[PDB]
Structures are given as C-alpha cells and as structure tokens.
Amino acid sequence: WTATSGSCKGRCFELQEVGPPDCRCDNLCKSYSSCCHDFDELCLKTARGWECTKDRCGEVRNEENACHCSEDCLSRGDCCTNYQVVCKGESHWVDDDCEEIKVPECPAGFVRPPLIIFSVDGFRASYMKKGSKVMPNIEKLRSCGTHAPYMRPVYPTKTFPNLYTLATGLYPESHGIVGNSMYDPVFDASFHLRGREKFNHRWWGGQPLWITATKQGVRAGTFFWSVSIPHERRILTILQWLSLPDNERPSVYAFYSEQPDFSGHKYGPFGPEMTNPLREIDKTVGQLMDGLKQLRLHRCVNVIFVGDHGMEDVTCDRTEFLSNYLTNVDDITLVPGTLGRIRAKSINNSKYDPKTIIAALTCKKPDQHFKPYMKQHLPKRLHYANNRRIEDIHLLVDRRWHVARKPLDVYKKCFFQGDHGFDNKVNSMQTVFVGYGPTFKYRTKVPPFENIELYNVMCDLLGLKPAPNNGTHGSLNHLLRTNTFRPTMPDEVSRPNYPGIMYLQSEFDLGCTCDDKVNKLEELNKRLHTKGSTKERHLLYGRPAVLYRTSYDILYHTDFESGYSEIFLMPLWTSYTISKQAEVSSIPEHLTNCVRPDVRVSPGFSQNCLAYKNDKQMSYGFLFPPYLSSSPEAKYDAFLVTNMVPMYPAFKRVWAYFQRVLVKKYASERNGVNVISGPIFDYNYDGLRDTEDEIKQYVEGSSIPVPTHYYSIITSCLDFTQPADKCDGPLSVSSFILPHRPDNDESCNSSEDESKWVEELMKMHTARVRDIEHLTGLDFYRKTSRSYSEILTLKTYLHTYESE
Numbered sequence: 029w030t031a032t033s034g035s036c037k038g039r040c041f042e043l044q045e046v047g048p049p050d051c052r053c054d055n056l057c058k059s060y061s062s063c064c065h066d067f068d069e070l071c072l073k074t075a076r077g078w079e080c081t082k083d084r085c086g087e088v089r090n091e092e093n094a095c096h097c098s099e100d101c102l103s104r105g106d107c108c109t110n111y112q113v114v115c116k117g118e119s120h121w122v123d124d125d126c127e128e129i130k131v132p133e134c135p136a137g138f139v140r141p142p143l144i145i146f147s148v149d150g151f152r153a154s155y156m157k158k159g160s161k162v163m164p165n166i167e168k169l170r171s172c173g174t175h176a177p178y179m180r181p182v183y184p185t186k187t188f189p190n191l192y193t194l195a196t197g198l199y200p201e202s203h204g205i206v207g208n209s210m211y212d213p214v215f216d217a218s219f220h221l222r223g224r225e226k227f228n229h230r231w232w233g234g235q236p237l238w239i240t241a242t243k244q245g246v247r248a249g250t251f252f253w254s255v256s257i258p259h260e261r262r263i264l265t266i267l268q269w270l271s272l273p274d275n276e277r278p279s280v281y282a283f284y285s286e287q288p289d290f291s292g293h294k295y296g297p298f299g300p301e302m303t304n305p306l307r308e309i310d311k312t313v314g315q316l317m318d319g320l321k322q323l324r325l326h327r328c329v330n331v332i333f334v335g336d337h338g339m340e341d342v343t344c345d346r347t348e349f350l351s352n353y354l355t356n357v358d359d360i361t362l363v364p365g366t367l368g369r370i371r372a373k374s375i376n377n378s379k380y381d382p383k384t385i386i387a388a389l390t391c392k393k394p395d396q397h398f399k400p401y402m403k404q405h406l407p408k409r410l411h412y413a414n415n416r417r418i419e420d421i422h423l424l425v426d427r428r429w430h431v432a433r434k435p436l437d438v439y440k441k442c443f444f445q446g447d448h449g450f451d452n453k454v455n456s457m458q459t460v461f462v463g464y465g466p467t468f469k470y471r472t473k474v475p476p477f478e479n480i481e482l483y484n485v486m487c488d489l490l491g492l493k494p495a496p497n498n499g500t501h502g503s504l505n506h507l508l509r510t511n512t513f514r515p516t517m518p519d520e521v522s523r524p525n526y527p528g529i530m531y532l533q534s535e536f537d538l539g540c541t542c543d544d545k546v547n548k549l550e551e552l553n554k555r556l557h558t559k560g561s562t563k564e565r566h567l568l569y570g571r572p573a574v575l576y577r578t579s580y581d582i583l584y585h586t587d588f589e590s591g592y593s594e595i596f597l598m599p600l601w602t603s604y605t606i607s608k609q610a611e612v613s614s615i616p617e618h619l620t621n622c623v624r625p626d627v628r629v630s631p632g633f634s635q636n637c638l639a640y641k642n643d644k645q646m647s648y649g650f651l652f653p654p655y656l657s658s659s660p661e662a663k664y665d666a667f668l669v670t671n672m673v674p675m676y677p678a679f680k681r682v683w684a685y686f687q688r689v690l691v692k693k694y695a696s697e698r699n700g701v702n703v704i705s706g707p708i709f710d711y712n713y714d715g716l717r718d719t720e721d722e723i724k725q726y727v728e729g730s731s732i733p734v735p736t737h738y739y740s741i742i743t744s745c746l747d748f749t750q751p752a753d754k755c756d757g758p759l760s761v762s763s764f765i766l767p768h769r770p771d772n773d774e775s776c777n778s779s780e781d782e783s784k785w786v787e788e789l790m791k792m793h794t795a796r797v798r799d800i801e802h803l804t805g806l807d808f809y810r811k812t813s814r815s816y817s818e819i820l821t822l823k824t825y826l827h828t829y830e831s832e
C-alpha cells in the first residue's frame with residue numbers, strides 16, 4: 029500500500045528513500061508504482077525541451093520549464109546544459125582543446141573530486157573505433173583520458189550480473205546475482221527481469237559502492253534509474269545534485285543508459301540502425317560535459333565511461349533444441365538462451381539422473397553448438413559454481429547461438445538479431461573503459477583488464493577502504509595519477525625445510541622398482557646440484573611463498589626445484605627453465621616404469637607404487653618432465669617418487685603432449701620459458717585451496733590425495749629478444765588450470781591425435797596467475813626486479829587466445 033496523496037514538492041529526486049506507506053519522490057519510485065501523485069508534474073517537467081535558444085536567453089524564470097535559460101539558472105543549478113553556449117558565447121566542451129588536468133580544479137567547499145560513472149548497456153568494445161566518427165564527445169574522453177582497448181566482463185555476460193560486479197568487485201557466484209533469471213532453492217523463490225521479487229534485498233550480496241561510501245561518511249547519489257525517466261532528466265538531476273550545499277552534496281553518482289543494448293538486440297551489433305543510438309549516447313555525454321563546464325566542474329570531476337558487456341549476432345534460426353537430444357525433455361527445467369542451466373522440473377521425481385542427461389547431451393551431433401558441463405568442471409577462469417543458485421548442469425553455448433528446450437519456446441514467446449551472455453573471453457562480449465579527470469592519467473592507454481578490478485579503483489578515487497572483494501588491489505594503479513594503493517606482499521606463513529640425505533634405500537618398501545644400479549669430478553658436481561647450485565637458473569622469480577600453515581621441503585635438482593608437501597605427499601609446485609636451445613629426449617626403455625625413492629624424504633612421507641598398481645583407474649605422471657632432462661644422468665632425478673603425481677590415463681594423454689611437445693614449442697616461440705607446475709585440490713568448487721579434510725578421493729588404499737586440477741605458469745621476457753633466464757625488463761605470462769578428469773568427454777575430437785585437440789583444451793582452461801594463487805595458497809613472483817604493482821598486473825593477466 030502506497031498512500032500516494034503525499035507530495036513531492038521540494039523533494040524531487042530525493043536521495044534518502046522514504047518508508048511505506050509514505051509516497052516516494054526518488055529516481056526508482058516509478059519502478060515500484062510508489063511515486064506521489066504529483067511526481068510527474070513537479071519532477072518530470074518537459075516544457076520547452078532540453079536546450080536553450082537565442083530567444084530564451086535571459087528570460088523570466090518560468091518554473092514549468094524542463095530547464096532554464098534565465099540569468100539566475102547557474103546559481104540555482106538548473107540551466108539547460110547548453111545555456112552558456114547559446115546565451116554567453118561559450119564553446120561546447122567537445123570543441124575545446126584537451127589540456128592536461130594535473131590537479132583537481134574544484135569550487136570552494138569540495139572535499140574531494142566527485143566521481144561520475146556513465147554506464148552504458150551493451151556497449152561493445154569495438155564501437156570505440158567503429159563508431160568514432162559519430163561519437164566525438166566519447167572520443168575526446170577516450171583520447172584525452174586513460175583508456176583500455178577493452179574491458180572483460182564477468183560470466184554470464186548479462187546485464188545484472190555485470191552491473192552488480194561493477195558495484196561490488198565480486199564474481200557473480202559471490203554477490204549472488206548469477207543471471208538475469210534465477211531460482212534460489214533455500215528461499216524457494218525466483219528472480220526475474222520483470223516483476224517484483226528482484227527488489228527483495230536477500231538476492232543482492234556483498235557491499236556495493238554506494239553502501240561502502242555511505243558507511244564511511246561519503247554521500248552517494250542513487251545509482252538505479254526508472255526506465256521512463258528520460259536521459260536528459262537523469263543528467264540534469266546529477267547536475268542539480270552537484271549544486272547542493274557541501275554537507276548535502278554526494279561525492280559519487282551514476283548515470284545509466286539502456287542503449288545501445290536495447291537496439292542491439294533488435295538490429296544486431298552493427299545493424300545500420302545502430303548509428304543513431306550511438307549518436308544519441310554521445311549527445312548525452314556532451315550534455316553532461318557542457319553541464320559540468322558551466323558549473324566549473326569539468327576539471328574537478330573524475331568521469332568513468334563503462335559498459336556492462338558487448339553484443340553478438342544471434343538469430344532464431346541458430347537455436348539448438350534439447351528436444352532433439354533428450355527423450356525426457358518434460359522432466360527438466362531449462363534456463364535458456366546464450367547459456368543453459370538445467371535442473372529437475374520436480375524434486376519429487378526420483379528417476380531424474382544428471383549423469384544420463386549429461387551423456388545424452390555430449391558430442392551427439394557433429395557441429396553441436398553447445399557443450400554440457402557439471403558446473404564444477406567449467407573452466408575455473410569463469411568462477412561460476414559456488415552458489416546454490418547455479419544449477420549443477422550447465423551448458424556453454426557457442427557464440428552466435430541459443431539453446432532452448434523445445435521449438436515451441438522460440439516461435440511462441442524471427443524478431444531479434446543480437447544477444448549476449450556467452451563466455452566472457454569472447455571478443456564480441458568485451459566492453460569499454462575510459463577514465464577522465466584529475467585522478468586519471470593523461471592521454472594514456474592501459475592494457476585490457478577485468479571489470480572485477482574497478483570497485484577497488486572507484487574506492488581509491490573516493491578515499492574509501494574497499495570491502496573484501498575479488499579485485500587485486502594495486503593491479504590498476506597504472507590507471508591513476510595519484511591515490512594509488514600501495515600494497516605489501518603477503519607474509520610467508522610456513523617456512524620450508526631443506527632436507528639432506530637422511531634415508532637408506534632399503535628403508536623404503538614402496539613397491540617401486542627402477543633399473544638404476546649403474547668418479548670424483550662428477551660426484552662433487554651432483555652434490556652441489558642437490559644443494560641448489562642451478563637454483564638461480566630454474567627458480568627465476570624467487571621461491572613461491574606458502575601462505576598457510578603446513579610442513580614442506582624444498583628439493584633441489586640439476587634441472588628443477590620443488591616445494592614438496594609432507595601432508596599431500598607431492599609437490600605444491602615444481603619450477604624449471606627450458607631455454608630456446610633445449611633438446612627433447614625420450615624416456616629410455618630401461619626407465620619406462622622406473623620410480624626411485626628420494627633419500628631426502630622419509631618413506632612415511634612418500635607415495636608408493638603399489639597403491640597405483642592396485643588402483644585400476646589411477647596411474648601417475650611427473651611434474652618435471654623426463655623428456656626435458658639436460659643429460660642422461662640428470663634424467664634419473666625426474667623419476668624420483670617426490671616428482672610423481674596421480675594421473676588418470678585419459679589425463680596423461682593431455683599432460684604428456686603438453687610436456688613432450690608444447691613446452692619446447694613455447695620455449696622456441698618465446699625465447700626460453702620458465703615453467704611452474706603443480707596440483708590443485710578444489711573438491712568444494714569455491715576457487716580456494718582445500719584443506720586436507722576436504723579431499724574426496726585418494727589413490728586406492730593410500731593417503732595419496734587426488735588433485736582436481738593441474739596448473740602451469742609459463743613465464744618469459746616480454747622483450748622476446750632477451751632469453752627468459754636473462755630478462756632485464758617486464759615479464760610475459762600464460763597459465764592454465766586443467767581439469768584432472770578420468771575421460772576426455774569434454775573434447776569431442778579426442779579419438780584423434782593429441783595435435784588436433786589438446787591445445788584447444790588448454791586454451792579453454794587458460795587462467796590468471798591470481799586464479800592459481802587462490803587455488804593453492806601460494807604467492808608467486810616474490811623476487812623480481814619489477815615494481816609490486818606491475819607484478820600485480822601480471823598476476824591478473826589472462827591470455828585469451830582470441831584474435832585482435
């Protein structure tokens with residue numbers, strides 16, 4: 029119940045929302061059908077449009093008008109945005125030369141530069157170049173300010189997940205807005221684009237920027253705008269709030285535009301009809317900048333121009349139907365479109381079986397345009413699993429396609445030509461970032477970055493301490509002239525042991541065998557290798573720090589160094605450098621099944637071969653590859669029981685190709701590489717390192733835990749004329765987190781030679797170093813000659829394998 033008989037007089041676009049049944053006058057009241065009776069008359073004035081004209085200059089103030097051209101308008105803060113241009117001979121902001129903003133130039137009584145976020149729905153990254161001729165205001169922001177070529181959204185690349193990620197710095201799985209449509213089984217309630225339930229606060233987790241600001245004494249404008257409020261009025265409202273007295277004026281504001289998304293869905297991303305929406309958005313930016321200029325705020329405010337996601341060509345005819353794969357199609361509920369989520373229609377149906385659904389959807393048609401996954405098997409870079417609102421069964425849909433349950437769903441709902449929602453590495457889903465203002469750099473291009481990072485930066489721009497989030501604070505310091513955040517490296521929690529030779533061969537009863545029963549020059553030489561004489565070649569960036577309490581040993585060898593966990597009975601990490609000149613060799617016949625006890629490590633803290641023999645499903649591989657040994661004598665080190673890890677035979681096909689072929693290929697292409705490899709255990713799919721008591725699978729009959737994933741971090745010199753091991757400058761990295769699966773069902777062409785499918789798998793499971801850090805509790809690149817913020821940027825880099 030709204031008692032809509034109250035009034036909005038003196039209350040138009042009030043910042044504090046009032047409680048029912050009192051009627052509302054805020055920028056969202058329309059959306060709740062809760063505005064006072066006189067809201068439209070008083071607060072949504074339209075009379076005479078949005079622009080001054082020569083004939084209105086110096087007019088008598090008529091309070092009916094949308095905006096004002098009277099002499100008093102500037103001090104009242106309600107001039108049309110083009111007032112000084114039409115009536116005082118000033119230039120539009122866009123026509124002025126760019127001039128560096130070295131310091132904020134603010135009116136008296138401003139405590140900090142305000143921040144205005146100008147958010148545009150569906151603004152694909154390539155619009156900045158492709159629409160540059162029709163967007164002169166945006167192009168001035170872009171060229172004069174700080175810009176990225178693109179900004180990566182989160183998955184799913186839908187509106188609400190991305191807007192809320194912008195607000196919180198959180199992955200969708202953590203903030204809880206995991207799609208534009210959702211069912212929460214704990215609440216037994218649904219969230220939809222239309223309707224009321226989405227306004228309930230229990231959907232929205234973490235702490236959005238407006239709440240962070242308010243809690244720390246920084247006033248905020250309301251970020252959400254009812255659809256019917258025209259853009260011109262949103263801009264005039266922001267400019268009016270900026271004219272409030274010091275103790276009432278917000279420091280942070282957001283504008284939102286439903287364009288170009290709205291048109292993009294109708295016409296496709298580059299439909300000829302798209303030119304006008306882009307023009308109109310530019311015009312709106314121009315109104316804001318002219319408005320700020322009139323108020324003497326154009327060299328005071330920091331402006332961010334940002335999108336939520338891009339837009340792809342998608343038509344009705346590119347729909348896959350689940351009714352073409354499943355006989356039982358009426359026993360499931362599908363969330364459809366550019367992703368798929370499946371659950372049982374009825375929780376009372378005991379016959380429903382996700383395994384049988386997954387198998388009926390796996391590699392069934394030759395050009396099949398979706399791939400099913402249990403959510404825990406999705407690429408870890410998506411961070412899309414740890415929420416009860418994410419259904420166990422997920423369909424990753426190819427770009428340009430839709431999935432639906434039955435054909436009747438698609439013609440009883442062609443209309444549309446654009447959509448979005450796909451994997452966040454897809455080029456067409458990328459969006460924009462420009463920062464302009466005293467706190468941003470001048471005429472500076474920055475590399476692409478993820479939208480999860482922006483919350484920290486917005487907090488930096490406002491002098492706020494961010495709530496805990498998934499950004500890496502400091503990784504965007506290179507965007508900023510000042511207000512940088514200067515983090516310290518986390519402290520190492522566990523120091524390593526450095527064991528020497530402590531065990532005789534006959535103390536080991538591991539069931540292992542090796543044909544290895546085979547000189548003072550080379551006896552001293554190998555002792556020095558065991559004490560760490562080559563460690564500077566193979567450990568280029570320092571040893572990784574262990575950020576949790578555990579017991580581990582550093583093990584040195586000729587060709588590799590490892591941090592060996594006494595708790596998990598395997599390395600946490602193995603580090604080695606392969607030069608451009610390195611040779612690949614085979615595993616000699618006499619060593620095929622060789623596993624050797626490590627006399628530095630107790631039998632009790634070692635794996636054993638008999639467990640692998642007994643376990644009919646599980647085999648083993650090596651972290652440092654025997655294929656890349658520096659010499660026949662050094663190769664023996666690769667067969668130590670301390671370099672062994674559990675591997676399903678299906679995974680060994682992947683791993684062996686990586687080790688035998690791809691490492692050398694990368695060393696050839698990049699002028700040497702340093703590789704750090706290791707296991708990951710994430711049985712609860714939260715993206716974080718499991719403790720021992722979370723492990724769900726062991727090698728049969730043993731205490732040897734089975735990894736859920738294997739990582740590798742492959743680092744070289746960004747200047748590829750310098751070898752990886754003698755690099756003076758910035759680094760280059762690529763990483764992966766491969767799922768450790770007992771089949772290759774994920775790869776539809778896996779019956780073919782590994783040269784036709786392994787690399788494609790590895791690209792799909794590309795990762796950030798930071799993702800590996802979360803998953804392992806390790807901190808990498810501790811000892812470089814580079815600035816810590818630069819290393820933070822490096823750790824957030826994702827190699828996407830998309831063309832330009």
Ligand SMILES: *[C@@H]1O[C@H](CO)[C@@H](O[C@@H]2O[C@H](CO)[C@@H](O[C@@H]3O[C@H](CO[C@H]4O[C@H](CO)[C@@H](O)[C@H](O[C@H]5O[C@H](CO)[C@@H](O)[C@H](O)[C@@H]5O[C@H]5O[C@H](CO)[C@@H](O)[C@H](O)[C@@H]5O)[C@@H]4O)[C@@H](O)[C@H](O[C@H]4O[C@H](CO)[C@@H](O)[C@H](O)[C@@H]4O[C@H]4O[C@H](CO)[C@@H](O)[C@H](O)[C@@H]4O)[C@@H]3O)[C@H](O)[C@H]2NC(C)=O)[C@H](O)[C@H]1NC(C)=O
Binds near residue numbers: 202234496498
């Ligand atoms: C991305 O960044 C984020 C933010 O930093 C990281 O997420 C954090 O991860 C922490 C570790 O998992 C997690 O810490 C737990 O918090 C529990 C208290 O949580 C409430 O309060 C906070 C603070 O205000 C609030 O933010 C939380 O919000 C979550 O839940 C509400 C629903 O209630 C949602 O609206 C909201 O969206 C958010 O959901 C997300 O997180 C929860 C988990 O908290 C998930 O379940 C959801 O799916 C979704 O992802 C909460 O309202 C606290 O109780 C936990 O403490 C237990 O564990 C410790 C281990 O040390 C143990 O010692 C304690 O005894 C305790 O265990 C007891 O409870 C267990 C569970 O019932 C029980 O099994 C035991 O037997 C024990 O009795 C824990 O500290 C933190 O909450 C989240 N924060 C957020 C915002 O998500 C995230 O990890 C980053 N991701 C990556 C990949 O790096």
Ligand SMILES: O=C(c1cnc(N[C@@H]2Cc3ccc(Cl)cc3C2)nc1)N1CCC12COC2
Binds near residue numbers: 251
């Ligand atoms: O209703 C809105 C809408 C959306 N977003 C906003 N505002 C944005 C929120 C937000 C979050 C973070 C940042 Cl940094 C900026 C902004 C501005 N306003 C309205 N949409 C979206 C689809 C519908 C529902 O009906 C149409």
Ligand SMILES: [Ca+2]
Binds near residue numbers: 150186187188337
């Ligand atoms: Ca959107």
Ligand SMILES: [Ca+2]
Binds near residue numbers: 709711712713717718
């Ligand atoms: Ca975990």
Ligand SMILES: [Cl-]
Binds near residue numbers: 184186206207209363
């Ligand atoms: Cl969705």
Ligand SMILES: [K+]
Binds near residue numbers: 641642643644645646
């Ligand atoms: K076996």
Ligand code: NA
Binds near residue numbers: 772775776778
């Ligand atoms: Na296969």
Ligand SMILES: [Zn+2]
Binds near residue numbers: 150187293
């Ligand atoms: Zn859309």
